[PDB]
Amino acid sequence: TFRKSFDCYDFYDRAKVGEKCTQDDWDLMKIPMKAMELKQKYGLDFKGEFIPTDKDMMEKLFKAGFEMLLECGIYCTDTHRIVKYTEDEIWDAINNVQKEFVLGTGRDAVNVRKRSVGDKAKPIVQGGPTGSPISEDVFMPVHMSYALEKEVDTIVNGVMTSVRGKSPIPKSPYEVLAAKTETRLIKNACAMAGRPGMGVXGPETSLSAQGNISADCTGGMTCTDSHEVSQLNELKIDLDAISVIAHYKGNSDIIMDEQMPIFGGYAGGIEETTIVDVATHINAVLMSSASWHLDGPVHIRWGSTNTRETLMIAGWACATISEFTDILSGNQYYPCAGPCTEMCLLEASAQSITDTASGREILSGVASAKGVVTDKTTGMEARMMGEVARATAGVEISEVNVILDKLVSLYEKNYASAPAGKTFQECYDVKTVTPTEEYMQVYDGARKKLEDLGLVF
Amino acid sequence: TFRKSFDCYDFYDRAKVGEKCTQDDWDLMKIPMKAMELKQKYGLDFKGEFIPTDKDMMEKLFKAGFEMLLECGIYCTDTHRIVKYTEDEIWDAINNVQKEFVLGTGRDAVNVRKRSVGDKAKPIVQGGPTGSPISEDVFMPVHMSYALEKEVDTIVNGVMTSVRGKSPIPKSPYEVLAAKTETRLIKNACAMAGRPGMGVXGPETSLSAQGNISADCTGGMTCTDSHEVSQLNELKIDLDAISVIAHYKGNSDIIMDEQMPIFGGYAGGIEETTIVDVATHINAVLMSSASWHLDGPVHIRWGSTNTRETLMIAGWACATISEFTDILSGNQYYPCAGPCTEMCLLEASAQSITDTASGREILSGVASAKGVVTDKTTGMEARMMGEVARATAGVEISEVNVILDKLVSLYEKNYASAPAGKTFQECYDVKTVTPTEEYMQVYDGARKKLEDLGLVF
Amino acid sequence: TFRKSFDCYDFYDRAKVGEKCTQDDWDLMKIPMKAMELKQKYGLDFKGEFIPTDKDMMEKLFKAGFEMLLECGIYCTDTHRIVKYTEDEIWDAINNVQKEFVLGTGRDAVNVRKRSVGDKAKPIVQGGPTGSPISEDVFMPVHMSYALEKEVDTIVNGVMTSVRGKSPIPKSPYEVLAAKTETRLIKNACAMAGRPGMGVXGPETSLSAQGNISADCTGGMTCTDSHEVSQLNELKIDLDAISVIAHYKGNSDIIMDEQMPIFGGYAGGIEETTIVDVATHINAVLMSSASWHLDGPVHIRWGSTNTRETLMIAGWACATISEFTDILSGNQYYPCAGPCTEMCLLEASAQSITDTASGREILSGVASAKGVVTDKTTGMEARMMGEVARATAGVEISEVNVILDKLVSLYEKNYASAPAGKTFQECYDVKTVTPTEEYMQVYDGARKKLEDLGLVF
Amino acid sequence: TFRKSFDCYDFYDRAKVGEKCTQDDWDLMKIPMKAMELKQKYGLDFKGEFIPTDKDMMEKLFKAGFEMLLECGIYCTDTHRIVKYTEDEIWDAINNVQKEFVLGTGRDAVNVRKRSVGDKAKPIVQGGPTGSPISEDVFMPVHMSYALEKEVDTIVNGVMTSVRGKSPIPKSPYEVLAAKTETRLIKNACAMAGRPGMGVXGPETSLSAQGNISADCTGGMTCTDSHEVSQLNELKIDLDAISVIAHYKGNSDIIMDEQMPIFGGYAGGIEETTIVDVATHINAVLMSSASWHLDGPVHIRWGSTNTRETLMIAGWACATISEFTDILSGNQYYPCAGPCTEMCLLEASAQSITDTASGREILSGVASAKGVVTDKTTGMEARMMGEVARATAGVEISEVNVILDKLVSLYEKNYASAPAGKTFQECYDVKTVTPTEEYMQVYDGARKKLEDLGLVF
């Protein structure tokens, strides 16, 4: 049996004395070799499906992911050593996950409970700039554009490009100021939208351990919000995250561990990256004591989470995690196109369909324009994400796979020419925080195409 | 109809003017006569089953328990008088029980909802010294050994053998100090384990009404913890408990009424003691306004809750209560053997199998070494209790009965020679609060035997 | 030096092994002998003054009181043994008393800071039924009559003659219900008077340790209220109080220790009883860890706190305690006459003059009709107590002594014929909670007589 | 005029673009040159006095300290640049300091208000291990030894040598665990001493910014506790502290900035080091937005704060700061000798006399054995610190200077042979947390010598 339930403290202990290994030996050899080995040994073949209908193949994928984690372990960047788990420790973690939890407070709180593949229940819609850079002078209005949408249940924080007119440089006092201020301003925006108790997910502006740890404060982040800790790529972590985890646990905070496996990255192709994905879902409840895990498969070239490959990775990982474990999870949205464009909405829609049908409990989006363009994120994208989730709930998986194949084909040849889109200030009336007629028309166009494919809103 | 929903105040009123009766007339005549009468009138025969599969027999057991309570009433030790209920008052209590509730706070909180016989859902694992005497210098470490186990959901408090180096003598200021300190220290231990909001069950060190009433305090017991009030043996209560109940109700505290029927005691044999058990489950929601009831059938000779007879009593009482009422309940663990012994683990395992399959919502253990030996309780026993509960969930009752018959036969001939076991200090590294290799090996041995019997972990 | 700062735990320890002594040996020998001895050794003679102007005599009184406590100790009724203190332990207690504290919350909170003899600052006016029996159907209105008076700063709780129509018999669940309900209802009355945060002093309806300990609750008594623990007569205590003290300390509650020395009681005459009074003021911060001490010298025959002798005892004790220590204190009011009578108002006025000029920080009244007649207490008596306190503040002590001599002579020949007075229902419009014209006229008459004596309102 | 009131954000801004300077150029040239220059220009000569009686010399010392800060600025270690203030910015900071504040909660809270030189009011006694290393298994008992002393008002945290049996290595998760656990355990110890609301000062076990920032938590440090940020030597700071300051400010935490000027260090001798001391008292309210400043002049060779020179530095700095500003402050205690020795008590006594008479509001001690020896700190040292403070309050400064000269001469020739003393476990009964007869006798011996010198307890 195991000595004790594994936690961040055991991780630190092992990271200091584990097998010495260069990061290249990990990225260019150990990881790709194991993913390749397990794919062939289990004969994994997704056969073009976005969401699996072959439970035998799903079980083999689960075993592969478990074995990937067990045989490889986790690479610690700071100590350049490998941390290994025992089979019993992994099962103790999987056998004792958080069953459910509540986000937000008062009338605005929402319950997060497990969803099954093809579940009639609608997932939680976590809308927001999704870590995208937002100008300080419109930080509240931008977030209010999400709170004003009934489709949105919780908020995923954007990043302040400045606080008191200064850049929140990591390890500077401005980073601490931003960490606390970020959620304080966002909850104030929610209150202005008549929803003071909406839960949020962050912190996002801070990057260092000290900055992230300073985020919990009065009026700011509290135990009813999702606290983010990020795993690295692939099956890797830094000590900063380990200390942040200890902090979240010590404050009784709901913990959201995230990991964005890279298709075409160190793991390899579709099945290979999915094995890594399953492994990181498991690592979340083991290393990070996560309450829930946020996935986000991204294309090495396009940097989007809604390409055919990344959608298949997410669909299979989630359906498998949903079938063999009670781990709560979500997926994050990074479309290529920017706001106020039909492509952006169709991209997010494809992912919403995939996430909803595959069993995700939470949809966290939308980081339009790949989340790297200042002010290019608005509540309209989250509205579509939510409406599409409702349209997808309860639909037969066979039908969903057909719809996805048709939808993805509508934009997958235009990644390189994805429209830049517009900023919040350009497609919204900033004063009243309402979308322009231009955006409403674009929205209708996208919705019509989705209906032509078979979706019923 | 009834005048008003019955409560502790009505009990006091009636206890002062009820039928005068000596305690011997109650214990040696009224109780045994009625149990004997109802057993024969309803033709109760459990036919060797630990968990019933005959719903007709179960219904007769329910009617017998109801009638036992209705015809006998409750004996008040302080006034030496009998309190009687009306049929309508009993039904009003049964028809309006607490449907569900939450224990603990923040990320660490857990929901307690009704379970059915053979339910696939796993019961709540309430681990702790279970009222056993624990040395003051290791009070926190011992409790931390339970909080560190992911298998454990809430903590059941141990008893401080001293506070500030002094015995917490009843009605002395030290009893009050211990009542408040007990949970304050335990929640601090939970926080050190990264679970600040774990719910607890107590108070345990205090014995008088004034001591028990002083337990609610800042940093200590709060409304999200289970508050214990104890019924006496059999269908009996003292006025101290009645005042404690008034206090719990006045503080909006979750109330856990407990009663440990004695097999071979005043009621008589198996079926007779089970009739009393059902009667006390009902009395819990009537007299104590209980949120949930904690059972604990104990063998008059062995003083354990896991003998063949006591397991049958618990299994039938719970399955019947689960079938005909919505009363939430649990069972407490008192093995003969001490920690770090195979027998102790097998004893607790037999009870976990029984409690899980019979429909218990909460498992409260483990009071190893019969809970009377200082420092002889560790988190390892609770880990087994939890893992066995998971293994049992969803298993066909017919199969469970077969497994139990085989398992109990493995130790039921060794009660008189049950191994003393070791203390926490002997089978754990007190500094890191981790089990020794010795214990881990003993644990594996017990687990292997359970697997050979058919349990799948 | 001392081993540790003395507390209730040390008291319990010593009470179990101290010198065995019958209560008669204590009351009829040890106490009267020591008081007699110290009076003569220090040549104490108050020479008719209500408030001392001879600092040398005051210092001798202080030394006598200290020595009374040091040489006698405290008799524990439950163990029939004597607890002794060391000189160093007593000084550690006197040298480290609570400097100040706040009562109540929000806008309604008030600061309690030390007052000197003849201080221009007005003492805190704690108005209420002062433990008098109040009918359940008018419990809120009666207390509201005090909250409606701007003269009143905090409330001193009355006693519920019934709760839910039943007597709150000690050690019955009704006592617990009353303990919590008492303050809940009173604070609701304060809220109706537009002062939701007024602090209170209690609990009063409960008498047992378990009842008193149950008083702290949501909506009821909290740390910003004065928590009462009562010393016995004379230099005596029971273990119930010792446990209650442990409870108050464990909840960070402001503690008000009270002791009502009896003139003509076991101690003897005026100077003798004052020596005991000083000794009990000191015992308050030693045995009870008091935040402040409530005095209340009472006449053995008349049962009032405002006779010439009891006023002199209070005046000298307080002036001396104020001169040589920083112990915060107050005095309680028990007039012979009932409400709506001129005598009642004059009696309370004499005490208010004495308490204010002698240095009391808090005036707790008024228990009209000796506090033993149902519903015979109203806010009008507290209004007079407060207005007279303002009139007295800053007045030269020589002048105060002259006024007191004249005032007390106005009623001291009528103790046996003191008017019964009327109930709240008879001298107030219960619906609007306002005094009748009858009472207002009686009030004016008393006020006029006080003005003729020299008081300026 | 100034652009804006100066804060940590302005400091960061300036630290990035200020004058480049090597640390040697700062320590070996800029600082010593300016201190030397200002000492001579103002003709500073303390003429052997511990506490000044020459207000003209005091005013010159104030001007020198102000000018030291204005002309030198502050060296930032991380950027190797100098931050400069303007005269107007410094005055804005000095002209707007925190007037007063409250530490702790409930009955246990205490007010901190300004004291003058020779004030009759007693300073706040902040007792504790004072950052000394304390074994995990006695962490609570050791701190309880301070809470049990009525002389002690607040607690100054010790350092956990281990948490869950592991060293709290900086930037490891154990550091975060210790940061939160430290105060949680200490407040639990205070509660066991019957003082749940005692305020504390920390965090102490953590050393990194992330560790310090994680200290605020439920059950742990809160806004009513003093939050420590440390300045470096001399007129120097690191960016970690700057971020910690931003965090404290963002949480509305009471901030305690500390700086321990080294006699014989970079500044030079007595007057030179005092100029630096005054400069750092001012820098506290400027750079750190301090609520109060903690001094601690230490001897370069002996490493103690109670040598003749360090006492003179503290006395002059405080008397001057008290005379010309309203800056609240305290001093920390580092005796050479260990617990249970007469020298240790006499050393701390000399400093208590100096701090009390010079105007300190808070006395933070005692770090016996120079605070570097595991478990060598007990409440007895704080008791002496407190009793001596009471004895000193109100005494004429001329008399205090005479007493100090005599007292310091009693031990100043024995620094090299200062007795090692004993651990808490050796001079206390760990179970009851009470001093041994051995310590009580040592205590009496020291007290007698202090009385022979003229102190009246």
UniProtKB/Swiss-Prot annotation, chains A, B, C, D:
Listed Gene3D superfamilies: Monomethylamine methyltransferase MtmB
EC identifiers of the protein: 2.1.1.248
Keywords tagged on the record: Methanogenesis, Methyltransferase, Pyrrolysine, Transferase
Matches recorded under InterPro entries: MtmB_MeTrfase, MtmB_sf
GO biological process, one term: methylation
Stretch forming the signal peptide: none
Reaction catalysed by this enzyme: Co(I)-[methylamine-specific corrinoid protein] + methylamine + H(+) = methyl-Co(III)-[methylamine-specific corrinoid protein] + NH4(+)
Protein's pathway: One-carbon metabolism; methanogenesis from methylamine
Keyword Iron found: no
GO MF entry, a single one: monomethylamine methyltransferase activity
Family from the record: Belongs to the monomethylamine methyltransferase family.
Assembly description: Dimer of homotrimers. Can form a complex with MtmC (MtmC1 or MtmC2).
Miscellaneous note of the record: MtmB1 transcript is abundant relative to the mtmB2 transcript.
Task of the protein: Catalyzes the transfer of the methyl group from monomethylamine to the corrinoid cofactor of MtmC (MtmC1 or MtmC2).
This protein's name: Monomethylamine methyltransferase MtmB1
Underlying gene: mtmB1
